PDB file of C-alpha atoms and ligand atoms in Angstrom:
ATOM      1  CA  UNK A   1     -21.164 -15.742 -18.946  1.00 20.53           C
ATOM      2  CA  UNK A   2     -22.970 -12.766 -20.321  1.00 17.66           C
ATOM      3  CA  UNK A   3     -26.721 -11.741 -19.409  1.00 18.45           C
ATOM      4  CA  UNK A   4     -29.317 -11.362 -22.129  1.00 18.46           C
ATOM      5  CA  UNK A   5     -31.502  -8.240 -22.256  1.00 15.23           C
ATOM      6  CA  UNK A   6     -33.805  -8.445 -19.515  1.00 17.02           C
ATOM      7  CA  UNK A   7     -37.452  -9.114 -20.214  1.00 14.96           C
ATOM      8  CA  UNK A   8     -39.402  -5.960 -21.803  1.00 16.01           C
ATOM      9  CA  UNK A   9     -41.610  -3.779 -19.906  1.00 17.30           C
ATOM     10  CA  UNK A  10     -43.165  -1.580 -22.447  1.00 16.72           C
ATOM     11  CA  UNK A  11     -44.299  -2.725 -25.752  1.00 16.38           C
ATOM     12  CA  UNK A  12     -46.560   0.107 -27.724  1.00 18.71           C
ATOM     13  CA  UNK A  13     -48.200  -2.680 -30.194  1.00 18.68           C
ATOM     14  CA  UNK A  14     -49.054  -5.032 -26.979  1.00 23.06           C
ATOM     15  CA  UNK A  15     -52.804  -3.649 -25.799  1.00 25.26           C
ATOM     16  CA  UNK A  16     -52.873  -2.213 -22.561  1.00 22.56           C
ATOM     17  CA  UNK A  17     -55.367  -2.263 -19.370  1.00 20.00           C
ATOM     18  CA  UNK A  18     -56.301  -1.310 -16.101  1.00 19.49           C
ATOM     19  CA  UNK A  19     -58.669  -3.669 -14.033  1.00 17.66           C
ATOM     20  CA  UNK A  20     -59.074  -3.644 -10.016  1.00 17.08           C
ATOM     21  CA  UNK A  21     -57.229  -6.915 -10.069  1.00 16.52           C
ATOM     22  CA  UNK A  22     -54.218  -5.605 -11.754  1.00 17.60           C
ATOM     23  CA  UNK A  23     -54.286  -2.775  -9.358  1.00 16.97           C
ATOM     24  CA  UNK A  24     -54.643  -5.021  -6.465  1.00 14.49           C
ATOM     25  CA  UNK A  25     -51.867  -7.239  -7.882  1.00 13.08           C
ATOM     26  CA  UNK A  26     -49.252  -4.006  -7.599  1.00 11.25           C
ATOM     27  CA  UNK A  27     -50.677  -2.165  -4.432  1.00 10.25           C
ATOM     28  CA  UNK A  28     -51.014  -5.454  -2.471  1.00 10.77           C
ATOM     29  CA  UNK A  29     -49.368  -8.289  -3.732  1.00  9.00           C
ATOM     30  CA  UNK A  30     -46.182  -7.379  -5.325  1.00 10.03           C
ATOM     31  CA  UNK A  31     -45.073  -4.267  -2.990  1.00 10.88           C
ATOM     32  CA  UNK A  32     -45.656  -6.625   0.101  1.00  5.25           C
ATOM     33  CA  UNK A  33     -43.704  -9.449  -1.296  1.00  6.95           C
ATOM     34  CA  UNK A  34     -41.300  -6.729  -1.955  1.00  6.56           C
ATOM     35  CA  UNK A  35     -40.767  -6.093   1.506  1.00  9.68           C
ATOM     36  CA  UNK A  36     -40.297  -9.716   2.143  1.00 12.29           C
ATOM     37  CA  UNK A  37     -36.776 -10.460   4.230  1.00 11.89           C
ATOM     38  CA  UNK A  38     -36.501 -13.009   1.656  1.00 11.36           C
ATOM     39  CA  UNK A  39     -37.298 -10.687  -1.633  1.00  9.37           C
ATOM     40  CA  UNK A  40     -33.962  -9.524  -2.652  1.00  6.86           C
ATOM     41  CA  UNK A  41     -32.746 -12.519  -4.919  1.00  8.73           C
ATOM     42  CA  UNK A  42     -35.651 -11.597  -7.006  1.00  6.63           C
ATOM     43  CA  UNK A  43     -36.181  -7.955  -6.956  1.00  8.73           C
ATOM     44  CA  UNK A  44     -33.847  -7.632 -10.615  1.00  8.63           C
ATOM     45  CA  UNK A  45     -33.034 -10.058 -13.109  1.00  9.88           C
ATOM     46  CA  UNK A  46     -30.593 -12.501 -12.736  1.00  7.89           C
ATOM     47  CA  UNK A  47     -27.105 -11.481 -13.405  1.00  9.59           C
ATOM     48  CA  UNK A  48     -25.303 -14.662 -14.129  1.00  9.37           C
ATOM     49  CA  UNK A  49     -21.968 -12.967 -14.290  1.00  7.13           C
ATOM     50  CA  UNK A  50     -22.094 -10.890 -10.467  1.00 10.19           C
ATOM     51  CA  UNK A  51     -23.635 -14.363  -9.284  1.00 10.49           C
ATOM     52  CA  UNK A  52     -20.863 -16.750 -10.882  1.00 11.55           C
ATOM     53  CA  UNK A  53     -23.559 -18.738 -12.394  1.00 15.70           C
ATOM     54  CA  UNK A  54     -22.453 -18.625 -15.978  1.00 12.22           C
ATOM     55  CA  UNK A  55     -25.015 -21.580 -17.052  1.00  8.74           C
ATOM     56  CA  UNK A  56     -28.217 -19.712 -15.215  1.00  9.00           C
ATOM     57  CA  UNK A  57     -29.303 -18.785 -18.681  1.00 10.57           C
ATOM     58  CA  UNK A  58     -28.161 -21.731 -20.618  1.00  8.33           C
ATOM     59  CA  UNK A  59     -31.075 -23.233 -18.487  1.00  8.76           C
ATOM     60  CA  UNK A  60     -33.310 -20.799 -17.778  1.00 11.78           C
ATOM     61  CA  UNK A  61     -34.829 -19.743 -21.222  1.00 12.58           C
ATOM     62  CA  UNK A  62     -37.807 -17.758 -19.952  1.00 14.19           C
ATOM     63  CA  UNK A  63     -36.373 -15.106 -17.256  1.00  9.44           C
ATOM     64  CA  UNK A  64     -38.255 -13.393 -15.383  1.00  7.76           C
ATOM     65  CA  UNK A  65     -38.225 -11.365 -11.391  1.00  6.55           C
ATOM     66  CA  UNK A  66     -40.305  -8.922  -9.849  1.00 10.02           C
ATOM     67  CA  UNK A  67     -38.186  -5.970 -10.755  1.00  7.51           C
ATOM     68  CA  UNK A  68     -39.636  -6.403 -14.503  1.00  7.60           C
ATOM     69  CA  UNK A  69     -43.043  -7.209 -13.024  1.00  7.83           C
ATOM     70  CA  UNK A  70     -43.424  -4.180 -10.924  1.00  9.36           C
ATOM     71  CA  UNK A  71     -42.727  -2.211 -14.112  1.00  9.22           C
ATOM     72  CA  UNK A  72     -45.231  -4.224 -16.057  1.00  8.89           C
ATOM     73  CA  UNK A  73     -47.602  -3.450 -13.653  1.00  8.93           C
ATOM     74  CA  UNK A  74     -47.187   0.505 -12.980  1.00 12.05           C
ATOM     75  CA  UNK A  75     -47.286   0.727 -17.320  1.00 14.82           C
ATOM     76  CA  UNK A  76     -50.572  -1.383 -17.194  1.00 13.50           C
ATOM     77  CA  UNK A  77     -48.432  -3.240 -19.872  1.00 15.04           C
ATOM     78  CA  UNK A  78     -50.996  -6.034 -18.861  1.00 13.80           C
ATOM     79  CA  UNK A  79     -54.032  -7.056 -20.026  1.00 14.44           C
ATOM     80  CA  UNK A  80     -55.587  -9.037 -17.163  1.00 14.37           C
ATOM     81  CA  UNK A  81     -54.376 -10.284 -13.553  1.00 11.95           C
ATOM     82  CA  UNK A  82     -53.924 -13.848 -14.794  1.00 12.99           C
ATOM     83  CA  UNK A  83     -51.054 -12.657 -16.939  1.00 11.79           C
ATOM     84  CA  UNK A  84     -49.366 -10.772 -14.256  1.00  9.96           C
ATOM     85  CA  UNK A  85     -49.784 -14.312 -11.852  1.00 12.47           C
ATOM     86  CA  UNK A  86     -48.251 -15.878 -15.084  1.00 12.73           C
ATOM     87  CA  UNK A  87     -45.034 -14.170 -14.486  1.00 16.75           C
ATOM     88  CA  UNK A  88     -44.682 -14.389 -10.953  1.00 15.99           C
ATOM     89  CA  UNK A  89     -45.024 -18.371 -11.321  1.00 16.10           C
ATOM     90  CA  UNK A  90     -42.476 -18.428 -13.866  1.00 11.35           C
ATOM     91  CA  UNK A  91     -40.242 -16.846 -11.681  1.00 10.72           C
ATOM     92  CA  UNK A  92     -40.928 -19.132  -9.353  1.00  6.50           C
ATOM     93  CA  UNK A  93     -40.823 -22.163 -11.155  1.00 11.00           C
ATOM     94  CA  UNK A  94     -37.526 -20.854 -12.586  1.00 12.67           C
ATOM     95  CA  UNK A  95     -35.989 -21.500  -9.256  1.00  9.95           C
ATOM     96  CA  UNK A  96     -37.153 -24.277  -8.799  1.00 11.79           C
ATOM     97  CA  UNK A  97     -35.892 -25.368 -12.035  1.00  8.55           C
ATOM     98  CA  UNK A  98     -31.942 -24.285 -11.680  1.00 11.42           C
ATOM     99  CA  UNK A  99     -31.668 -25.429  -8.204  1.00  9.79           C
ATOM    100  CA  UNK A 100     -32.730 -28.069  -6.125  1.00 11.06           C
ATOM    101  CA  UNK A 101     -34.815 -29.026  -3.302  1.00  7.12           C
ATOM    102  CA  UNK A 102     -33.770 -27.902  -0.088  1.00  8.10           C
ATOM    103  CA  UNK A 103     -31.275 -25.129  -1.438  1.00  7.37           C
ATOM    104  CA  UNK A 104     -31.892 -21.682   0.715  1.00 10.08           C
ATOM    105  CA  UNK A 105     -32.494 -19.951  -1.973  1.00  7.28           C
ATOM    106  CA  UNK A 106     -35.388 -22.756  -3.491  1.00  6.44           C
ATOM    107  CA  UNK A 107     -36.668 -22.320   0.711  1.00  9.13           C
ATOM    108  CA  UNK A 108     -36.995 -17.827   0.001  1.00 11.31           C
ATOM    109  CA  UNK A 109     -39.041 -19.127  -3.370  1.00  9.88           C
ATOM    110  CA  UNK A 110     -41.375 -21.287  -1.345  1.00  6.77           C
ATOM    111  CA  UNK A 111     -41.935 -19.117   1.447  1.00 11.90           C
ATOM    112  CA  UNK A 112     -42.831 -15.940  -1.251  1.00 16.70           C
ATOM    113  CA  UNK A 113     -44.678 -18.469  -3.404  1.00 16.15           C
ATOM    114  CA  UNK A 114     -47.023 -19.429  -0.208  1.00 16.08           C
ATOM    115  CA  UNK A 115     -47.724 -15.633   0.727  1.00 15.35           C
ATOM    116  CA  UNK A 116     -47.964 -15.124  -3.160  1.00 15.26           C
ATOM    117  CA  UNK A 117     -50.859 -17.754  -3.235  1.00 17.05           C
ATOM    118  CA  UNK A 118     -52.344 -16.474  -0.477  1.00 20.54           C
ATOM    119  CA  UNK A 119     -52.857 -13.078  -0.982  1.00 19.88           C
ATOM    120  CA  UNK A 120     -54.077 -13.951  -4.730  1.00 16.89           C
ATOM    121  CA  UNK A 121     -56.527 -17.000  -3.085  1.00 17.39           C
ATOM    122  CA  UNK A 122     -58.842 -13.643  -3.134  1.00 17.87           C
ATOM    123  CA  UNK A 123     -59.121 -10.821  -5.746  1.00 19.25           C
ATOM    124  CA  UNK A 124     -61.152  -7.982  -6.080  1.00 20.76           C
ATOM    125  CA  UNK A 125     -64.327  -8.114  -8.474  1.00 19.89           C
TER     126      UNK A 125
HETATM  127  C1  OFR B   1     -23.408 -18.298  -5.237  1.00 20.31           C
HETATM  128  C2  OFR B   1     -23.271 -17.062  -4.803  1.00 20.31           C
HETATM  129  C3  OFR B   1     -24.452 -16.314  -4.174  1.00 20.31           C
HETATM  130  O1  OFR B   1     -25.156 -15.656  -5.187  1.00 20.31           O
HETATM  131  C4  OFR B   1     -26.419 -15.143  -4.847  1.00 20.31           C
HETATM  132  O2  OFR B   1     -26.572 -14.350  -3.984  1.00 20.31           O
HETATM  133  C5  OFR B   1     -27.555 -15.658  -5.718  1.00 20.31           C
HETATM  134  C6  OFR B   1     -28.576 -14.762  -6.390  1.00 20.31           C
HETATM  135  C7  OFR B   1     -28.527 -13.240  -6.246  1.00 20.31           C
HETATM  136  N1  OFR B   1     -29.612 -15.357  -7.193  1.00 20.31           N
HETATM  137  C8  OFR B   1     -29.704 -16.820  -7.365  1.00 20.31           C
HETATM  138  C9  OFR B   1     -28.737 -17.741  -6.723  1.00 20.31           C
HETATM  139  C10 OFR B   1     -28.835 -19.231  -6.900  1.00 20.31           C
HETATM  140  O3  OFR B   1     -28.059 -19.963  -6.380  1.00 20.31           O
HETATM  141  N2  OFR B   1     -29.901 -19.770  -7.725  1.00 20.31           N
HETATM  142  C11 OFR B   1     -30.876 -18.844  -8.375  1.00 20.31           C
HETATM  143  O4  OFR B   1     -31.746 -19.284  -9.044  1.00 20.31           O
HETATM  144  N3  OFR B   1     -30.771 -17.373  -8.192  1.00 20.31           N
HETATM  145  C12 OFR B   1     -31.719 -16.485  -8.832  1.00 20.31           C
HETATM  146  C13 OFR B   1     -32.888 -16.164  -7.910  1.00 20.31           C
HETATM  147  C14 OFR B   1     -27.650 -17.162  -5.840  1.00 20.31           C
HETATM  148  C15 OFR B   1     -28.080 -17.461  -4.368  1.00 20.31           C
HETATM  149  C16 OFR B   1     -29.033 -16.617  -3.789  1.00 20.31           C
HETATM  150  C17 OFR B   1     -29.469 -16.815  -2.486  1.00 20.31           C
HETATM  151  C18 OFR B   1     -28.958 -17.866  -1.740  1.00 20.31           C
HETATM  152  C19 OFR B   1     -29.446 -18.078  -0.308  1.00 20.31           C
HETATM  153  C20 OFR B   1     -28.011 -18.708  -2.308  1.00 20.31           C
HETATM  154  C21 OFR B   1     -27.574 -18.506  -3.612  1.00 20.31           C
END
């Protein structure tokens, strides 16, 4: 039930930059969702064997959890905030994929989605 290599977070050949959104996204968004009661499940990548879920990553092709993002982030390994939101809404979506409606841990994704989407509703300029 082994765990691929988690997502990179540095890529030298990938150009890099710094914009107030991208700042915004790291010293607002992300380390308040951090704090979240409900943030742990998704503060590291998945680890399908610790979890017992030895399919997680026979469905879940595109992996991804804030751990990795906050890295992203604090190397500017971005190039613009919409990439950044990109990855948060995969995570997302990937629970929403593996589990179902109603599971607790698809009810921590929606309540972090709806303070995600509201604290990006407005971005600096
Ligand atoms: C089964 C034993 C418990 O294992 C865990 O604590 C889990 C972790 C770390 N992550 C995931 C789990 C899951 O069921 N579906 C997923 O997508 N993820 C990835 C985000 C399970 C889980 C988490 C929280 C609740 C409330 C229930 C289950």
């Amino acid at each position: 039930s082994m765990n691929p290599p988690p997502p990179e977070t540095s890529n030298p050949n990938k150009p890099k930059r710094q914009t107030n959104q991208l700042q915004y996204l790291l010293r607002v968004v992300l380390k308040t969702l951090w704090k979240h009661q409900f943030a742990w499940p998704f503060q590291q990548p998945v680890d399908a064997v610790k979890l017992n879920l030895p399919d997680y990553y026979k469905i879940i092709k595109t992996p991804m959890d804030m751990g990795t993002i906050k890295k992203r982030l604090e190397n500017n390994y971005y190039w613009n905030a919409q990439e950044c939101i990109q990855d948060f809404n995969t995570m997302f979506t990937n629970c929403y994929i593996y589990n179902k409606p109603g599971d607790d841990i698809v009810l921590m994704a929606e309540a972090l989605e709806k303070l995600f989407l509201q604290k990006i509703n407005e971005l600096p300029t």
